[PDB]
């Protein structure tokens, strides 16, 4: 948050609405939503933007995207698989029973043609929790089959 | 806007600017500590055997006026201010107040003396007549003193201390609805052990307008106490209803549930799920060995 | 969902009002009305589950697992195979209620509802002061091998007074989420009291501690398994709503004589 | 409590108590004055000896006036073992 | 048109814009307090519930002739300042228990008392009803009244048909509320009772059933010895420590003001000394026709028959005969109440609790 | 291990700072009321020649 | 009304930050101000800009910055008395005339109250010490508080009512906070009165064995001694003790150092009473020719309270009896009913005099 | 408060401590009905645990002072608190001669007074009872408009009723 004196903001003083991202303050949320419409004094319309030259764009995709996975290439396949040799195998046994376990419990309330157990939002619960799941078995099957592929005698 | 608005009413109060947002809730029946009000009771007829006899005699007296206003009001009799039912404790006369409530549609409120003591200013004196003062908001039910007799499972059958002296406060209180309403919606059931509870104050009791006595435990009164609870798995009409009952000495209503939990106490070391007759010849005698003991 | 990650506050779910909006108690004891995230439901909680806040918003993020502070939390097993019942004799008059009221509820709950007679919720130990035991007690979860959870009367009024109701409801709570287990509570006298509670008045309130063992104690204790043990003294005065038989029904008296 | 958790990590050695008149009183109800806390400090005092932490190594020293205001509960065996004398 | 035009439009526009200037002093920014203590420097020190400390001045529309020390007055969030005085913040929630404005109250359930009752019509009614009887004669109306007898003669349906003629509220005490244990606080629940009668002024104070401990006769709430000497005395100081002339009234009430400590009584305030008797049979039947006013009786039933019968009874026992002989045709459904009812109400009713001396004749 | 003092705000709450320049081990006392900052709570006041204050009453009449 | 013309200065002393401050007190003065908060936080300041180093004092609230510390304004101290701030009062009903009859009751108490402080060069010449405390006690009914309400009108300063039920609060140990509350506005606003009233439910002598909790009382009296007469011997104004049972009082209470002038009332004789009826003859109706020295030798020794009590029952028999103003018939009358009616109770008549 | 009170003994070592009324804290109350207070007996617990503390280099000693002997905690007298028992019986005659010399020098009387008359016209008089003579000595000169005060007004100060004086009480003879 940056500051701009508007010193007298009685009459015809200057335009603060012009520039960029002006009339903000919708009821009674502004930021803190303490400051609602009048802000510091006399509605210093705060803007702030950023902007990036050539070098620092090409810095930052080398740097800092979401991680850091640069400069070293096989380790980081291998060690996420290496830590998680034990856990792998207990992620996957123990996600498979609480995959089940949740439709075991809200999928239960739609069988029939009719209405039984009264189902509202149950089918649609345990589509949802276990949309990820299948994803992230099918995930974990491709990288421990493939980091011990590719040639490595 | 404000018309919408009142006591008791939970609202939304915004973080920032500090100011009303929107109504969420009103304020819970219970208050303060413990605030026990029952509408509609589980209390039934059905479900309280042998008192079939005084069942009839405080169905005219206290439920027929409470149920019908307009008896008493019609016929020239004033409003009975209340009744209380004397004898033996334990039996659990507590239950006959709440089934008077269930059928007439009214609320059980309990007056306990844990809360007559409590931290406030200028609120020390308001607990004995604030339940008197919210009552007239719990629509016209009954009221039932708390811990004024020993139903079993309390204790304190009864004194000539203060909790003598709340009994007769709330009802002084019933003289001002008719002075300033003009109409009292307000009526207290009470139960003791003996008479000399009460205060002998204010020559004849216009307080309470019926005394009605309550009948010792008998045979016939417990046997159909028992068979009402009697009864959770298979059992046997070889055996007499009135033999268990003449065996059991003394023992009021609450009691009579003992024998039904040795009834199913040998049952459960034989891991049988029927009672046979060589079964209530043991469960009265460990019952009547239990009810001399302590 | 990976916005809050780490940086979350401890809190506990309270009622709810309206579509994945809802009241909660956060650990600083300021209660705010915040709403809930998407990918939670009110139905996937519970008015005793614990949930997470944000830092400055307090907004709710996620559901706490059933775990809390309990004072010091104990799994239920801590050194325990010691004693058994045969290190105190004589005790076969007290011990027979006994059995029949943590024994035989705690291996086969099924006996109870063979036979349709409710089992007692609670347990009270009786007694002039001075009466031993720390033994008995402790060696029905040793013989059974079950979970055991012991907290002392004056562990249940946390430093802060909001706090005091929180811990309360979590004591109940633990004890039924794993395994069958049993609660036991040393000189309870100090909060279960006859018309003196709050020795005429203190602090502010003192009582939330008293609401809270008498709410909850009607809320679990249903599959016949965690039972509740106090021990006290004679003060010649006692709690009547407490021994209630819609609350607590065993009550043993020492064999004093 | 501290006193007793410091016990493990400083070695048993000895925990004095200097005439204590207070908390061994059996304390009707007037309304007590505040003193509830006090109340919470018998009970504290009456459970750690009965307590499942182990103990027996540190000694614990109290002195007083006169015995009869002390705790009959804590007078009785299995929590104060030795009384001595100083006639 | 032109006085209309510099008046009401005028008016309804400055109403307008004051309303808004409160926006910086009544606006959302807005907290309370507790006033303590007020300075000639037009500051003051206010606590809120939160225990703050806030040193600031006084804003418009009020004076310091309204604050006083222990009321609340409204204070801000961010400017800090003392808004205005008020009244106390959600009330003491004293509205009717035993104060109210208008009894409904008549002089035939208290007939029989005629002779004592121009008593307390001419030292009470009289002379708040009409204040100009001793103001021209410039004599001292009695500045209250005491109250002595046997239970059941309407002891508080006697002022209670008073408080209706005056107009006025009517305060009522309770002899055990004052005697309460908490620790201490018997006199500082006496002081709050009459400081609310100096403020509305209400001109009347009544106490009903005088009791406290005369000897035990408590469990919850006892006070030990000492309470008994800051109690009865505190209701003496309250006479004793001020002078008024002609508002507060204080009547006392009780069973037996005989055992109560002569200074109690305060000689010089109450000049006036009712006694109560039962009703003779001249006047029980004005109470007997009202409650039988609106029953069915019978061709067999005459009220003279009632009234002889009666022998040493108080008022509600009329009533009472009424109802237990309403009650026995009620469980049979009969319209008109027989008199076999009749009869074996004013037999039952006569003897129920002690039949005999159990000693000798006497 | 090194040495760091331990301070109790009179908020009641506990904050840890490593050992000051400005003051001494030596000076240091445990249980003891000295100056510290408001925002980073370091200790740098030393002792006022008082342990805690003569709270209401008290005479210093010579 | 006046709306717009506070508003104007509140461009100036309202907008800026000055008067919102922290009440503190200050403990320790080094000459470094050690303070500490309300909210139980200390802390050590400087002077103000408009602040003068004599001004700030041991023991004293001194209002600081919430934001950055500072002394600004100094406060006056002791901020925590708020009941005995109501026992001030203004103009009093009951003049210094109103006392029926001149006796030695009045004479004694104007020479030890109301002239040392309306003439105190008088005793300076004989370099003498004027008895600070007073004694009035008597029996019930004789007006006690009629006298010394009467001083109060003739002094035209604060009068502070003390209540002996006041003493007792419902904490303990706070009785002995009311004690010093009474005693530091007697040097904060010098020359005022103060007057206990039924001082019998503290001071007294219970001794030990008993009771057991009735150790409060005995309390509040050996401290309201020792800000009597401690250590230091100081007072100004002076103090009026009176209750109803003087001898159920502390033994030490009745001995010098405290009280010196003992005055205590008496029954009026003939001559006392005849002018009862006299100073109450100017108001209500009195008939031409009537000698109410007649009526007062008809009625034997009582309590003033009771003499009164004829002159306005005298007026109540002619509105029941028919009568215009108040005759001579009426006068006796209200011997038989005053009096003769009255025998039973609601007097004293040599009660309570010891036991 | 006691805690603080020897903390300042501390810093100024060479002090003197005055505690007035000391039998205004102290009791047993054990036995009988209340349970006793424990609302006074805690700051007694420091006064014997301060004195037998860093405190007792004796230059912490103190002044008690108290009125009777009767009702006392009998623990509160050791070597290490309080040990000269000083009585302070009523003045002798010549002690009171010289203590009623002293309050009337600032009056102006005479010279004409002898105390050894009047010092054997006190018969038992406490150091305030003594106070109180000049005090009426000077009022009697007062309301009578004498310039001085003469032997007369002393003995007339001092007789007043009190005692058992004006007896309504039966016997006699």
């Not at chain 2, 406030?120 to 008197?132: A, Q």
């Not at chain 2, 003289?175 to 009526?187: H, P, R």
């Not at chain 5, 002022?159 to 500082?188: C, H, W």
């Not at chain 8, 002293?102 to 106070?131: C, P, V, Y």
Request: aromatic share 6%; hydrophobic share 35%.
């Amino acid at each position: 948050d940056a500051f701009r004196l508007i010193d007298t903001g009685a009459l015809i003083n200057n335009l603060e609405p012009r520039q960029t991202t002006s009339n903000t303050g919708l009821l009674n949320k502004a930021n803190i939503q303490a400051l609602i419409h009048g802000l510091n004094r006399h509605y210093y319309s705060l803007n702030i933007d950023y902007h990036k030259t050539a070098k620092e764009t090409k810095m930052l995709m080398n740097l800092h995207k979401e991680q850091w996975q640069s400069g070293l290439k096989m380790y980081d396949y291998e060690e996420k698989e290496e830590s998680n040799l034990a856990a792998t195998k207990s992620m996957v046994k123990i996600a498979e029973q609480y995959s089940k376990r949740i439709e075991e419990e809200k999928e239960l309330t739609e069988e029939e043609l009719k209405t039984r157990y009264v189902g509202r939002q149950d089918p649609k619960k345990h589509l949802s929790e276990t949309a990820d799941e299948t994803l992230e078995n099918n995930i974990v099957s491709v990288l421990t089959a493939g980091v011990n592929s590719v040639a490595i005698k | 806007n404000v018309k919408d608005l009142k006591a008791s009413q939970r609202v939304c109060l915004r973080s920032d600017s500090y100011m009303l947002h929107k109504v969420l809730e009103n304020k819970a029946d219970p208050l303060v500590s413990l605030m026990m009000v029952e509408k509609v009771p589980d209390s039934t007829y059905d479900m309280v055997g042998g008192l079939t006899k005084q069942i009839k005699e405080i169905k005219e007296v206290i439920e027929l006026p409470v149920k019908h206003p307009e008896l008493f009001e019609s016929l020239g009799i004033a409003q009975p201010k209340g009744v209380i039912l004397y004898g033996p404790p334990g039996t659990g006369k507590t239950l006959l107040a709440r089934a008077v409530a269930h059928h007439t549609d009214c609320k059980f409120i309990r007056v306990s003396g844990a809360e007559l003591v409590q931290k406030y200013i200028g609120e020390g004196s308001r607990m004995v007549r604030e339940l008197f003062v919210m009552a007239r908001e719990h629509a016209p039910s009954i009221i039932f003193m708390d811990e004024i007799d020993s139903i079993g499972s309390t204790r304190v059958e009864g004194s000539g201390g203060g909790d003598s002296e709340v009994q007769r406060t709330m009802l002084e209180l019933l003289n001002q609805l008719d002075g300033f309403e003009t109409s009292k919606n307000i009526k207290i059931i009470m139960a003791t052990n003996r008479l000399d509870i009460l205060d002998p104050a204010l020559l004849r009791p216009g307080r309470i307008d019926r005394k009605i006595e309550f009948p010792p435990p008998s045979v016939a009164a417990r046997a159909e106490i028992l068979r009402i609870h009697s009864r959770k798995m298979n059992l046997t009409r070889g055996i007499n209803l009135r033999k268990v009952a003449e065996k059991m000495n003394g023992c009021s209503g609450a009691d009579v549930k003992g024998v039904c939990t040795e009834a199913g106490m040998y049952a459960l070391r034989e891991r049988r799920i029927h009672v046979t007759q060589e079964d209530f010849e043991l469960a009265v005698g460990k019952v009547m060995n239990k009810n001399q003991e302590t | 969902k990976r916005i809050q990650s780490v940086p979350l506050v401890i809190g506990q779910f309270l009622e709810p009002i309206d579509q994945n909006t809802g009241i909660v108690s956060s650990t600083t004891g300021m209660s705010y009305v915040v709403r809930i995230l998407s990918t939670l439901d009110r139905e996937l909680l519970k008015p005793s589950m614990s949930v997470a806040l944000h830092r400055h918003s307090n907004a709710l993020v996620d559901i706490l697992p059933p775990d809390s502070d309990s004072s010091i939390s104990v799994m239920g097993e801590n050194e325990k195979p010691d004693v058994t019942y045969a290190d105190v004799g004589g005790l076969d008059m007290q011990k027979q209620e006994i059995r029949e009221a943590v024994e035989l509820p705690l291996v086969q709950a099924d006996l109870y509802e063979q036979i349709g007679i409710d089992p007692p919720r609670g347990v009270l130990l009786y007694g002039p002061p001075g009466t031993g035991k720390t033994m008995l007690v402790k060696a029905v979860a040793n013989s059974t091998k079950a979970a055991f959870i012991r907290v002392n009367g004056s562990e249940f009024v946390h430093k802060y007074l909001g706090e005091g109701p929180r811990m309360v409801r979590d004591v109940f709570r633990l004890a039924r989420e794993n395994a069958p287990s049993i609660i036991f509570i040393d000189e309870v006298d100090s909060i279960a009291t006859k018309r003196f509670d709050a020795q005429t008045g203190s602090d502010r309130e003192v009582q939330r501690i008293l609401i809270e063992l008498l709410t909850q104690m009607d809320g679990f204790d249903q599959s016949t398994n965690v039972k509740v043990i106090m021990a006290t003294n004679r003060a010649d005065t006692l709690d009547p709503a407490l021994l209630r038989p819609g609350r607590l029904d065993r009550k043993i008296e020492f064999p004093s004589l | 409590r501290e006193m007793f958790a410091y016990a493990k990590e400083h070695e048993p050695c000895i925990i004095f108590m200097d005439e204590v008149d207070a908390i061994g009183g059996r304390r009707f109800s007037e309304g007590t004055s505040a003193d509830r806390e006090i109340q919470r400090t018998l009970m504290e005092l009456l459970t750690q000896m009965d307590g499942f932490d182990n103990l027996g190594q540190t000694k614990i020293i109290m002195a007083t006036n006169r015995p009869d205001t002390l705790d009959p509960a804590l007078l009785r065996p299995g929590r104060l073992d030795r009384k001595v004398e100083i006639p | 048109f032109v006085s209309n035009s510099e008046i009401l439009k005028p008016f309804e526009k400055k109403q307008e814009e004051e309303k808004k200037q409160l926006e910086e002093i009544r606006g959302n920014p807005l907290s309370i307090g507790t006033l303590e203590e007020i300075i000639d420097d037009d500051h003051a020190i206010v606590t809120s519930p939160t225990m703050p400390d806030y040193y600031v001045s006084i804003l418009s529309f009020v004076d310091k002739e309204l604050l006083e020390p222990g009321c609340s007055v409204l204070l801000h969030h961010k400017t800090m300042s003392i808004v205005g005085v008020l009244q106390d913040d959600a009330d003491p929630m004293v509205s009717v228990m035993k104060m109210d404005k208008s009894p409904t109250e008549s002089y035939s359930d208290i007939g029989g008392l005629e002779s004592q009752i121009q008593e307390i019509k001419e030292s009470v009614e009289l002379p708040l009803t009409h204040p100009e009887l001793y103001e021209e004669m410039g004599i001292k109306p009695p500045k209250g009244v005491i109250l002595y007898g046997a239970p059941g003669t309407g002891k508080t349906l006697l002022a209670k048909a008073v408080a209706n003629q005056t107009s006025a509220t009517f305060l009522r005490i309770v002899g055990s509320e004052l005697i309460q244990k908490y620790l201490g606080d018997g006199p500082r629940l006496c002081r709050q009772i009459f400081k609310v009668a100096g403020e509305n002024a209400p001109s009347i104070v009544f106490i009903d059933e005088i009791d406290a401990i005369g000897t035990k006769r408590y469990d919850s709430n006892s006070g030990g010895e000492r309470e008994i000497q800051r109690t009865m005395l505190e209701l003496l100081n309250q006479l004793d420590g001020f002078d008024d002339r002609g508002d507060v009234k204080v009547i006392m009430a009780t069973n037996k003001i005989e055992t109560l400590d002569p200074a109690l009584i305060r000689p010089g305030r109450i000049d006036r000394k009712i006694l109560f008797e039962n009703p003779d049979l001249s006047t029980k039947k004005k109470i007997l026709g009202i409650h039988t006013s609106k029953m069915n009786l019978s061709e067999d039933v005459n009220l003279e028959t009632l009234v002889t019968t009666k022998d040493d009874l108080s008022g509600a026992d009329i009533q009472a005969m009424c109802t237990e002989a309403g009650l026995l045709a009620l469980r049979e459904r009969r319209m008109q109440v027989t008199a076999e009812d009749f009869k074996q109400a004013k037999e039952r009713v006569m003897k129920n609790k002690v039949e005999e001396n159990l000693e000798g004749l006497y | 291990v090194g040495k760091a003092a331990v301070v109790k705000t009179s908020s009641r709450q506990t904050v840890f700072l490593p050992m000051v320049g400005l003051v001494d081990p030596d000076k240091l006392k445990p249980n003891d009321l000295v100056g510290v900052n408001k925002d980073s709570y370091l200790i740098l006041d030393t002792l006022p020649s008082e342990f805690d204050s003569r709270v209401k009453a008290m005479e210093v009449d010579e | 009304a006046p709306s717009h013309l506070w508003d104007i200065m509140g461009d100036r002393q309202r907008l800026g930050e000055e008067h919102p401050l922290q009440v503190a007190r200050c403990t320790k003065i080094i000459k470094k101000y050690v303070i500490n908060l309300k909210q139980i936080a200390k802390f050590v300041v400087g002077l103000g800009e408009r602040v003068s180093p004599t001004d700030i004092e041991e023991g004293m609230r001194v209002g600081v910055d919430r934001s950055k510390y500072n002394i600004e304004l100094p406060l006056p101290p002791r901020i925590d008395p708020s009941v005995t701030m109501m026992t001030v009062e203004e103009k009093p009903d009951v003049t210094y005339s109103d006392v029926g009859g001149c006796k030695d009751q009045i004479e004694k108490l104007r020479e030890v109250v109301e002239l040392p402080l309306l003439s105190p060069e008088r005793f300076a010449t004989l370099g003498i010490d004027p008895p600070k405390g007073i004694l009035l006690y008597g029996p019930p009914g004789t007006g006690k508080t009629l006298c010394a309400r009467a001083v109060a009108n003739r002094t035209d300063a604060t009068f502070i009512r003390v209540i002996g039920s006041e003493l007792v609060q419902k904490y303990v140990g706070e009785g002995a906070r009311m004690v010093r509350e009474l005693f530091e506005m007697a040097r904060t606003k010098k020359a005022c009165i103060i007057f206990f009233d039924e001082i019998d439910a503290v001071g007294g002598a219970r001794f030990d064995d008993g009771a057991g909790g009735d150790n409060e009382v005995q309390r509040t009296m050996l401290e309201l001694i020792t800000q009597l007469d401690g250590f230091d011997p100081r007072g100004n104004i002076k103090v009026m003790f009176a209750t109803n049972r003087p001898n159920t009082l502390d033994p030490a209470l009745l001995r010098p150092g405290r009280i010196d002038r003992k005055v205590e009332f008496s029954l009026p004789d003939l001559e006392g009473r005849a002018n009862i009826f006299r100073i109450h003859s100017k108001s209500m109706s009195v008939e031409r020719g009537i000698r109410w020295e007649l009526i007062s030798r008809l009625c034997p020794n009582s309590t003033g309270a009771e003499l009164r009590s004829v002159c306005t029952e005298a007026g109540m028999f002619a509105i029941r009896a028919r009568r215009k103003v108040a005759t001579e018939k009426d006068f006796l009358k209200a011997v038989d009913k005053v009096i003769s009616g009255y025998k039973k109770f609601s007097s004293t008549s040599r009660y309570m005099q010891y036991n | 408060l006691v805690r603080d009170a020897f903390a300042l003994a501390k810093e100024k070592a060479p002090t003197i401590i005055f505690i007035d009324e000391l039998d205004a804290i102290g009791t047993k109350r054990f036995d009988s009905e209340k349970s006793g207070d424990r609302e006074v007996q805690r700051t007694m617990l420091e006064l014997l645990n301060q004195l037998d503390g860093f405190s007792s280099d004796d230059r912490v000693k103190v002044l008690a002072a108290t009125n009777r002997v009767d009702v006392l905690d009998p623990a509160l007298l050791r070597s290490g608190r309080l040990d000269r028992k000083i009585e302070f019986p009523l003045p002798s005659e010549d002690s009171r001669a010289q203590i009623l010399q002293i309050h009337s020098r600032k009056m102006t009387t005479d010279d004409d007074i002898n105390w050894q008359e009047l010092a054997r016209s006190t018969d038992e008089f406490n150091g305030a009872q003594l106070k109180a003579v000049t005090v009426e000595a000077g009022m009697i000169a007062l309301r009578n408009g004498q310039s001085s005060v003469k032997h007369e007004d002393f003995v007339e100060g001092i007789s007043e009723v009190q005692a058992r004086k004006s007896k309504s009480v039966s016997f006699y003879a």
